[PDB]
């Protein structure tokens, strides 16, 4: 003669991850650290740019 | 880890050419330039043809 049966599992969290870079010259660094110095005609476009 | 790319691209101009030709017979171009010289009935003829 039969009984029922009860399971009982476990189950884990496992880690992953995402990476994506992103780079800037130099130039460009230069070109935003300013702090109030700059402003001439010339160097607002390649600000922009 | 990857860093997304720029492409940048020139064309050229290439040139090129088309060419026709058109021929006038040496008969209607002394016909064509009487300049009020004959006046007569026959070459009246002659002229619009």
């Known amino acids: 003669v039969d009984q029922p049966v009860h ?3 476990v189950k884990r ?3 992953r991850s995402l990476s994506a870079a992103f780079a800037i010259a ?8 300013n702090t109030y110095v ?4 010339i ?3 390649l ?3």
């Not at 700059?38 to 005609?41: H, I, L, M, P, Y």
């Open 7 to 9: 399971n009982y599992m």
């Open 47 to 49: 600000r922009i740019r």
């Open 13 to 15: 969290i496992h880690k």
């Open 26 to 33: 130099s130039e460009a660094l230069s070109l935003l650290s």
């Open 43 to 45: 160097d607002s476009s």
């Open 38 to 41: 700059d402003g001439t005609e």
